[PDB]
Amino acid sequence: MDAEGLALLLPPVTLAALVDSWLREDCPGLNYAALVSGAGPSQAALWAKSPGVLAGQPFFDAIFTQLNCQVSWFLPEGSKLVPVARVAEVRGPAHCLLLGERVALNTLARCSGIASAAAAAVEAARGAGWTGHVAGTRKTTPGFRLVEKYGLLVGGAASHRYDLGGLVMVKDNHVVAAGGVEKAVRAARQAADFALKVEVECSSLQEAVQAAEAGADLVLLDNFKPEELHPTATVLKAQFPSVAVEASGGITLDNLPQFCGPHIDVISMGMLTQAAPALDFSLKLFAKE
Amino acid sequence: MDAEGLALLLPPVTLAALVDSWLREDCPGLNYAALVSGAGPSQAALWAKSPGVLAGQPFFDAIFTQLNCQVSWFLPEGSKLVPVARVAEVRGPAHCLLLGERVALNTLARCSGIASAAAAAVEAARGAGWTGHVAGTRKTTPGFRLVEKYGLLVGGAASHRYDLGGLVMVKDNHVVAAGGVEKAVRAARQAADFALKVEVECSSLQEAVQAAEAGADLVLLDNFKPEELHPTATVLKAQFPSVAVEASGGITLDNLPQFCGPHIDVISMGMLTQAAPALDFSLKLFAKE
Amino acid sequence: MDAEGLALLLPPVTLAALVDSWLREDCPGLNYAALVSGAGPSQAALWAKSPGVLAGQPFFDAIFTQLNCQVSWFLPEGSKLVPVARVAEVRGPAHCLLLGERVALNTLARCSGIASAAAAAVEAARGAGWTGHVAGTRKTTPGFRLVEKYGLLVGGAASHRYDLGGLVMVKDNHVVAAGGVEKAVRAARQAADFALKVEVECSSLQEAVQAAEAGADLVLLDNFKPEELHPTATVLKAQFPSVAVEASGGITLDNLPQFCGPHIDVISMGMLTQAAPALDFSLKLFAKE
Amino acid sequence: MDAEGLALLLPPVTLAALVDSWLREDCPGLNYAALVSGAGPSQAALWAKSPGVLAGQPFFDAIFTQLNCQVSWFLPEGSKLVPVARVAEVRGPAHCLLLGERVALNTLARCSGIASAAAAAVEAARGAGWTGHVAGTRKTTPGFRLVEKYGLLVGGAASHRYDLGGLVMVKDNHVVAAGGVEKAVRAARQAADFALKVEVECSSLQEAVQAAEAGADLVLLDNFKPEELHPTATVLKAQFPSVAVEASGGITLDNLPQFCGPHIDVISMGMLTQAAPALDFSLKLFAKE
Amino acid sequence: MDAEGLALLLPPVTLAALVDSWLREDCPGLNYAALVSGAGPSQAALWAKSPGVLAGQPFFDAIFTQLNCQVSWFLPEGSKLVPVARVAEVRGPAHCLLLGERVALNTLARCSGIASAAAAAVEAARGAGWTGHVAGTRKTTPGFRLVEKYGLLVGGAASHRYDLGGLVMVKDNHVVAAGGVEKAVRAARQAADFALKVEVECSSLQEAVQAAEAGADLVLLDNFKPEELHPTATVLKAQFPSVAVEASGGITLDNLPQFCGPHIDVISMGMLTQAAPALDFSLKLFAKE
Amino acid sequence: MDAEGLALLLPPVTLAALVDSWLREDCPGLNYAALVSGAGPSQAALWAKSPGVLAGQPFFDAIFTQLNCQVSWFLPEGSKLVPVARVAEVRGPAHCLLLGERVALNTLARCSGIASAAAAAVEAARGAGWTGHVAGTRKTTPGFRLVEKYGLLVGGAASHRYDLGGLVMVKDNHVVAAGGVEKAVRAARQAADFALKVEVECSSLQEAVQAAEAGADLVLLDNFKPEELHPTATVLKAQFPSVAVEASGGITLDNLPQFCGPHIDVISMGMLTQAAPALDFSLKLFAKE
Ligand SMILES: O=C(O)c1cccnc1C(=O)O
Ligand SMILES: O=C(O)c1cccnc1C(=O)O
Ligand SMILES: O=C(O)c1cccnc1C(=O)O
Ligand SMILES: O=C(O)c1cccnc1C(=O)O
Ligand SMILES: O=C(O)c1cccnc1C(=O)O
Ligand SMILES: O=C(O)c1cccnc1C(=O)O
């Protein structure tokens, strides 16, 4: 995509409600440190001290806008961060900058760190000649989904489904509960009348074929070794060429290339959200003359 | 210090609210996946697949209570996870179990992941002879502070001030805006009447002394090499024996012992929250009764 | 669709919150008519005074639950209503029973009113030997969508996309804004990726082909006369067998049979929500043994 | 009355909140369709496609304001709508115009639908030479009451009580629970100390006299056939000239002239909110010259 | 009446919501104090240390119910408090009792203090032979109206009009805005269609008469000396026998009998809410024997 | 203090939330009174009818801002009010001023009442040559703590800790629950890692010392007569120089000077918030073309 146009995804109602809560979480009562700085007009520089990808400007902006501060970016959303970079400047009343400071920073650090891993992982795949979509999961922080999924998009990963209402994903537990894969997929297909796709976690070739026969649009190959994964995917694409194939389970940055192959459409990774460290940013006030 | 007594810190109102919003994030509309599993009474086993410390039972319990499911814990809050362990059992209607599965796991993974890092770091400190307090920061995920600060406790580090509303904290930025460290602290110390303490970030011996003279209860030595840090702290404690010394900036699990000396009372670490990977948990239905 | 299992689609959090907002709407302050009834143990009987389909038990139930009342139903959810029928008995404190009454009845009235129309539309389509799906739209009352979309399902219609983060729908205005049907569907598919279906509104056969060619999952044939619809449908189906066709616009109970064909998969009708008179119900306290 | 000044009744806080819940209902997560339109400065025409009364302007406006879009109206609120008329022009970014489209349309459709049905009933009553008040009920869609009551006022009906903290209304059930009309009215008058009126639903002449005697500000005649209603009213009016008489139950636009008569003061009709079809409108983007 | 049956006025939704804000206000973060008491099953005695009237049981209860505690009342709601009285007893986990303490005490203290003041006023009114209704105002604490108005009622005063939603009160300002008293009342009367009473603030016998002629249901005689009030009110009743006559403005508990007279129906008092000191209660843990 | 620079303490999100709830409480539905005044541009004078200290401008401003109304203050926050003052002017639509009026007046009155009470007290203390802190308590009206604690500051008192997660307070009850003072304070000390202070309620010199020995930062001497208080305090300060001493319990404005001795640091007064009458203010519409 283009990372600058991604911001248009964020609906501005649910956005400001997020921002409000984040501020309240941090300053529920009186802001005593306000008195230290006073409210004089001020400027601070946003320092990027970690390599990766910048993401999260829409969140960073919104937070400060709520506090009557203005942000000037010196890079675009999505651009590569080359450490000790001065990536932006923030102007407003001192106390307002310093109240927004930590929250904006945390939001930007986390969003960026996710985008960073996603870009790293996308590269590694491109590098192995893979043409598919590296994806995320629902293994997001609670109440932080919007920021994390958006982060994955800025990094060039696909978001995967956002909600639980958005694609019907039959998993091991759904199959156990429904008493077998055929039964499960039949129900799943009925519930997704014509508007929603069905995906089915399958731990074996058999489970997959059963799923694919039953009319699954996607078959997720969960926890296969690579040497098992590709022959299994080959059989599937051969027999059901219109069915998409996702590999997930245990997949990391280091090993990702082994999971890439001509018959895998999607690779999903817990790690992009669950084990992607936050980038180091600071926001420092500089004096005017 | 009992880690099972820690759930009492959680006020039940802010807890049940948080849980609602987590579930609403994940499934705002219709849960089509309820139709695949139906609603038969079922049981699921919680499996820990990562080493660390188990943290977040109160949140796990709340999530599932909200969905009319019950939880039996086989290990106490804060115990070591020795992997491929069966840590607990969850009971309830199938569709209800599966609705809360991900959000619960996410929450538990995230909280446990932090506890583990805190525990690692506390152990490191103990191992380097040091009886001070290892601590968190305000570098927490937005909307998720309660879980992360609670996690820090369960792992046995200190939370630090929760929310900018406890302790008053003067930083590089407050000093710049106030036109001096002398001015900044006097203002800070006026604001925090008797109820609140004043801590000051300082980047030199000089700036520390000025702070302590000015009436600082705590003096944070920001971003020192340990070779500078300890001589500095030695003088401070000589000249102002009742002023506490915190050290912060660049402190990893790797180098933490280097910042563990006899005149350092608090060590705060960004990494305990920012860069602690989540633990791997799963929740698998079984068909006993 | 077994209509009694549909209640499993209702996540219990968003439900309970919605119930709260309805009761607060109807009684923001003090309930003065509490004093008129007092709080004597009491029982009322719900009478269905209109013909159609009973829908809304979950909502009815959950309103009374919030006011310590209990409901016992004598008809199953989705059953046929033959007038002057006793469908349930609600038991609880008089004042509570009387507080919930209008809100609970108003909820059951539209939900049933909508289901009734859906059932009638489905019946006319089965009646013209159509094996397709009758569907709702996003033409729903603001804030009431959960009840209305559930209503359609209980009457045997498809809900279409609930959401707008569900299926990606390119409409007449999108096509304009984009700058052409070709350029728009390219951009839709890219946003949709593997996770979502792209549906496109099309005013002619030419626009439909352009669309199918750009990779549309569903072509929606907007405001065609029946004489023009079916030729156009037959063409798309011969040339792109894997694309689903939707007819929509101007469709009524009376004319629906003329829109049924062997090459229409979905027919959506705005009237099913926008013009479905609410059923007559009432709740009258009786005396007990 | 002036229909344009009714907007003053709408307190801008409850209006804005209401709008946000509607917006959030339609797009809880990510707006994928933003990418198809993009953010081009754009303009749309509001086409009125059904006959009736225009109502809902202040809500329509509020919605788009919340998305940074400006509305310009060509008909004033309350004017007669003559089909295929251009009533307004909405401008702003393309993605925003399309985000608010369906919600704003759905709001205006239903408010106008009601206004029309009220105006229609007001007209037939005027046509019978009746000078009383046609009225709404509390039979409103849950959560949508502010819009529906307002629609009644624009069509020139009277909203009954909005609220329930409103007028005190003693109904058949209140009378049953109390054990007797005179008891009930005593209790109701006590609760309505001097600030509220007391109304009593009465199913006979005998009960209506009991209630009038006991001091009710109004007597509602609950299901009378018209041949019975007017003698019962006449007797009431002669015996208690300062009591007001409401006729309710079964009153359709077709039979309304028969319920009009010199001794009825208020005629409340459930149909106005429960069975008023919504109007047809559409919002189509045009390019400028 | 019966102060015990007043609790039925409080709808359980808006209670629990109110109680939740109050608790959140007091402990928005982690409750560190809970670790000092631990969770031992405990009991505590509520001690009334001031003279007055007890009011606020429903709130006190709700608060502790939310914290899983239970309350046994030794005196009924509305009874006379003779100091150092042991009025109730509260049981539940120690940290829960202690978390609820202050918030519940503050609530009961203020409700009780208002009911005391209202009683005092109702007494003096009765003592002076007057059969009217002492009333309060909209001079309530912001967001504490439910409790304050409830207190008035328990004290035996009237809750003058709760919300601005059910009576229509024309004031000095409304008249100025409207450009005269005739105009204002005329307008008000048309706004309050048949459901709502109109009250008019009048500062002179003229302005009162004018309002009465225009159709005012009540005439409020504002800031009159008593020697002016009673002649003014006698003319009023002479000409307008069915128009209620309220007196207001600087009426204190001391002079209240001077404002009592056969022609005054209602007496509102700012002081019942604005200057009613809180009672002194305390909650003391004891060991069981 | 500098009373004008105190507004900076008020975070703008929590402020605008609070203000919305006040407005929603006072007019949840339709504002019939808007029709009486119309929307004409108007102005209103704010009159101060009582002596005291002016407090609550930020809340006042925010309230009106929310209703598109501007305020011009002719007196700085916290100035002395000398009665019949014209302290400010409010411009806006007529219906908007009148909707805001009472809510804002109510806020300003109780904020100003408290500031006044506190100024009275701080004055007597400064008059008694005392250099310590006059403080508040947590005996604040529920849901209104921000306004009341802010008012205390403006009048020159200290807020004290605001909520239960500032300083950690051990009271009679915490001691009972812990089974002793030693145990309770150790637990509070362990809980208050380094971020917080521990304060202990003590009813005797011995208990004060046990607390001081166990590491208490402050010792609150509850309910001592002045004759006991000072000699107790003189001993503490001798034997534990850096422990602070707060007196509290029964300290009226009248007797306060008796509590102002050289070994007392803090004096807390329940009365400042529990028994401080609100000041008298009106807002009157005046003329302009
Ligand atoms: O549920 C998902 O959306 C999902 C998609 C791909 C891989 N894992 C998951 C998961 O959360 O378990
Ligand atoms: O603000 C804090 O509480 C804090 C405390 C210790 C270390 N870092 C921080 C920070 O957020 O920068
Ligand atoms: O958007 C939809 O879901 C939809 C689907 C089919 C027909 N109309 C609509 C509409 O709301 O206009
Ligand atoms: O209650 C009302 O407001 C009302 C007013 C007139 C007629 N019916 C009703 C009703 O809801 O039953
Ligand atoms: O507002 C009221 O209803 C009211 C009623 C009686 C006395 N004062 C008032 C007031 O203006 O606050
Ligand atoms: O608890 C407090 O914060 C407090 C502090 C000082 C004086 N009183 C109190 C109280 O409300 O009991």
Author numbering:
A (entry chain H), B (entry chain I), C (entry chain C), D (entry chain D), E (entry chain G), F (entry chain A): 1 to 289
Paper text:
QPRTs have been shown to exist as dimers or hexamers2223242526272829. HsQPRT is regulated by the interaction between two dimeric subunits. which can adopt open and closed states.
complex with QA or NAMN as a reactant or product. First, loops L and O of HsQPRT were closed upon QA binding. chain of H160 in addition to its interaction with the carboxylate moiety of QA. moiety of QA and tartrate molecules of 2.4 Å. relevance of HsQPRT-QA compared with tartrate as a QA mimic. can occupy the active site before PRPP enters. PRPP bound to the carboxylate moiety of QA to produce NAMN.
